[PDB]
Design an enzyme around this catalytic site. Structure first.
Site, PDB file in Angstrom:
ATOM      1  N   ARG A  59       1.212  -3.919   2.595  1.00 30.74           N
ATOM      2  CA  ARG A  59       0.844  -3.373   1.302  1.00 30.74           C
ATOM      3  C   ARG A  59       0.286  -4.421   0.356  1.00 30.74           C
ATOM      4  NH1 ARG A  59       4.224  -2.351  -1.508  1.00 30.74           N
ATOM      5  NH2 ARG A  59       6.116  -2.552  -0.218  1.00 30.74           N
ATOM      6  N   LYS A 205       3.188   5.062   1.961  1.00 32.42           N
ATOM      7  CA  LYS A 205       3.817   4.739   0.687  1.00 32.42           C
ATOM      8  C   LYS A 205       3.106   5.323  -0.524  1.00 32.42           C
ATOM      9  CE  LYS A 205       7.276   2.668   2.311  1.00 32.42           C
ATOM     10  NZ  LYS A 205       8.615   3.238   2.089  1.00 32.42           N
ATOM     11  N   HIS A 224      14.526   6.459  -1.479  1.00 31.40           N
ATOM     12  CA  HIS A 224      14.055   5.528  -0.472  1.00 31.40           C
ATOM     13  C   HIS A 224      15.288   5.224   0.368  1.00 31.40           C
ATOM     14  CE1 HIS A 224      11.482   1.744   0.578  1.00 31.40           C
ATOM     15  NE2 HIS A 224      11.570   2.626   1.557  1.00 31.40           N
ATOM     16  N   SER A 243      15.475  -4.630   3.080  1.00 35.16           N
ATOM     17  CA  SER A 243      15.359  -5.337   4.348  1.00 35.16           C
ATOM     18  C   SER A 243      16.534  -6.285   4.576  1.00 35.16           C
ATOM     19  CB  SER A 243      14.057  -6.135   4.397  1.00 35.16           C
ATOM     20  OG  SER A 243      12.941  -5.270   4.504  1.00 35.16           O
ATOM     21  N   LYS A 247      20.177  -1.180   7.437  1.00 33.25           N
ATOM     22  CA  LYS A 247      20.207   0.239   7.137  1.00 33.25           C
ATOM     23  C   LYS A 247      19.988   1.086   8.391  1.00 33.25           C
ATOM     24  CE  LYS A 247      17.102   2.502   4.446  1.00 33.25           C
ATOM     25  NZ  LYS A 247      16.541   1.913   5.673  1.00 33.25           N
ATOM     26  N   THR A 248      18.992   0.712   9.195  1.00 37.26           N
ATOM     27  CA  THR A 248      18.664   1.426  10.432  1.00 37.26           C
ATOM     28  C   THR A 248      19.768   1.331  11.475  1.00 37.26           C
ATOM     29  OG1 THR A 248      16.284   1.015  10.153  1.00 37.26           O
ATOM     30  CG2 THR A 248      17.050   1.666  12.354  1.00 37.26           C
ATOM     31  N   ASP A 262      13.360   6.790   6.309  1.00 35.50           N
ATOM     32  CA  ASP A 262      12.779   6.115   5.172  1.00 35.50           C
ATOM     33  C   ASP A 262      12.672   6.897   3.863  1.00 35.50           C
ATOM     34  OD1 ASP A 262       9.737   4.343   4.425  1.00 35.50           O
ATOM     35  OD2 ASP A 262      11.806   3.592   4.390  1.00 35.50           O
ATOM     36  N   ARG A 326       3.765  -3.123  13.235  1.00 33.45           N
ATOM     37  CA  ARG A 326       4.438  -1.830  13.191  1.00 33.45           C
ATOM     38  C   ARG A 326       4.089  -0.923  14.345  1.00 33.45           C
ATOM     39  NH1 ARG A 326       7.828  -0.372   8.604  1.00 33.45           N
ATOM     40  NH2 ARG A 326       7.188  -1.660   6.808  1.00 33.45           N
TER      41      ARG A 326
END
Length: 507
Positions: A59, A205, A224, A243, A247-248, A262, A326
């Site tokens: 981004r 996003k 989020h 990050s 979380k994942t 997400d 990604r």
């Protein structure tokens, strides 16, 4: 009927219009020898196609603008007191940026993909994408909810996106932009323009930012976060964390159904995934570490910037071109997910993850209503340097953060939701908290066993921790216990606490 729509967007001369192409048609288009530049896709040995995005492999928030007009009066504009990514642009700049986009996408074979953002039939947004690059069309097809062609019968776009990545803005200085790269949104025309950047994350996003605008204004929480339910599809849990917070890994459990990873919403029916796919990071990926993701990387999945040799052998570790490599793929590429729609009942447990390098926060804390809104607005984590990201996604907040914390807590009181500040970081030992402990703490949150555990309270932060937790070393429950002298803990605690007050000042 679609020609006038494109003409309404400023695009004319469409030679060929591919509408909602199937994965097959995308594959063929991506693997065409004629494809020059970054439009070309290569078939890896894993079956998934891979593409390069050029100069931008992530981004570019400095090139993100929103047209300043009446339609955007409710926008949380950046300012001296609180700086955010919502940078104002003039209606004049838009006209020229829409001209460039329109031209770049005129007189050539275009791809138009009409998709949905949000899995709840009600409260969902209809999105129309328009790009001249097949893989770009393939990306949105993976990342958004794919209508049944029946729903596409009379599809009326709520928001339109023009990806004009092959074009740029040389006169960026005069138009008041930051560079030749531009990602601009116009709420008056309900349109997003992408210029000079091929990073697919701009599309994902960008719409997330727009959902974060429309849903909260309708009492729908925009979050989020990742979200999962039990094997039965009940007892919904939502996970927040920046990050390095895990979380994942902490929301991916064998006895847990994945809703999304997400972007989620929370309307009257419950928690729903905004997305129809997953945009995962594959740097240093491993079939032994990420069985889910790995098995999801096949035909139809889209590898982005991963280095591959002439024979197609993917090297998920080569950080050469970028470390932000990604892969996008339909959600159904993962087995353990809620079906047939990525939606679930109101969340019961809300958890805020924090990788506290300061070793001050306890493994888990039963948040109160007020504290919940506070740490949400804080979005704390650590790298001993702290980083705060309001609502765990400050760069996507199109409205004031207090509005997201507001709607969120409101939806929590309706389903008897409870928030937890979990520290997946470190303690006093210096070594990071064991994954066996934190994961056991997560279990205590889901199974609800943390409801009966006694408490104690912690000075300064005024936290509430369980004196006992099944599957967790009782020693770790308190941040002090891992320190030689409780004085040391207080020193860092007093410091960290001080950093929270300073950062919360702008709020």
């Amino acid at each position: 009927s679609l020609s006038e729509s494109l003409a309404k967007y400023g695009i004319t001369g469409a030679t060929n219009i591919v509408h909602n192409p199937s994965h097959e048609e995308l594959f063929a288009a991506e693997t065409q020898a004629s494809l020059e530049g970054f439009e070309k896709g290569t078939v890896t040995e894993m079956g998934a196609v891979n593409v390069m995005t050029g100069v931008y492999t992530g981004r570019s928030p400095k090139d993100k603008f929103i047209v300043k007009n009446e339609a955007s009066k409710e926008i949380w504009w950046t300012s001296d007191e609180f700086k955010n990514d919502n940078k104002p642009v003039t209606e004049e700049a838009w006209a020229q940026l829409k001209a460039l986009a329109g031209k770049e996408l005129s007189n050539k074979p275009l791809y138009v993909v009409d998709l949905f953002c949000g899995a709840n039939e009600n409260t969902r947004l209809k999105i129309r994408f328009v790009m001249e690059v097949a893989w770009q069309a393939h990306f949105v097809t993976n990342m958004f909810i794919r209508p049944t062609e029946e729903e596409l019968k009379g599809f009326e776009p709520d928001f339109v996106v023009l990806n004009a990545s092959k074009a740029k803005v040389e006169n960026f200085k005069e138009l008041g932009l930051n560079s030749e790269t531009a990602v601009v949104f116009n709420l008056a025309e309900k349109m997003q323009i992408i210029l000079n950047t091929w990073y697919g994350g701009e599309m994902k996003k960008g719409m997330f930012s727009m959902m974060n605008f429309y849903l909260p204004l309708q009492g729908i929480a925009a979050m989020h976060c990742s979200a999962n339910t039990d094997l039965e599809g009940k007892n919904t849990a939502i996970f927040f964390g920046l990050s390095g917070t895990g979380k994942t890994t902490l929301s991916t459990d064998p006895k847990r159904l994945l809703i999304g990873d997400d972007e989620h919403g929370w309307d009257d029916d419950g928690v729903f995934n905004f997305e129809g796919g997953c945009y995962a990071k594959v740097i240093n990926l491993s079939k032994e570490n990420e069985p889910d993701i790995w098995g999801a990387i096949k035909r139809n999945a889209l590898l982005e910037n991963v280095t591959v040799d002439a024979n197609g052998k993917v090297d998920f570790a080569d950080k050469s071109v970028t470390e932000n490599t990604r892969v996008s793929y339909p959600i159904f590429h993962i087995k353990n997910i809620v079906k047939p729609v990525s939606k679930a009942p109101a969340a019961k447990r809300v958890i805020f993850l924090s990788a506290d390098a300061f070793g001050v926060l306890p493994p888990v804390s039963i948040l109160s209503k007020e504290q919940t809104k506070y740490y949400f607005l804080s979005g704390f984590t650590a790298k001993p340097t702290p980083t705060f990201s309001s609502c765990f996604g400050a760069a996507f907040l199109t409205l004031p953060p207090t509005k997201y914390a507001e709607v969120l807590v409101k939806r929590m009181e309706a389903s008897g939701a409870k928030a937890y500040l979990v520290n997946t970081g470190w303690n006093g030992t210096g070594k990071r908290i064991s994954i066996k402990d934190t994961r056991g703490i997560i279990d205590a949150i889901l199974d609800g066993s943390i409801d009966t555990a006694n408490t104690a309270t912690i000075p300064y932060f005024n936290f509430t921790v369980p004196t006992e937790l099944k599957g967790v070393d009782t020693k770790i429950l308190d941040p002090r216990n891992t320190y030689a002298d409780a004085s040391e803990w207080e020193v860092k605690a007093k410091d960290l606490a001080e950093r929270f007050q300073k950062n919360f000042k702008k709020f």
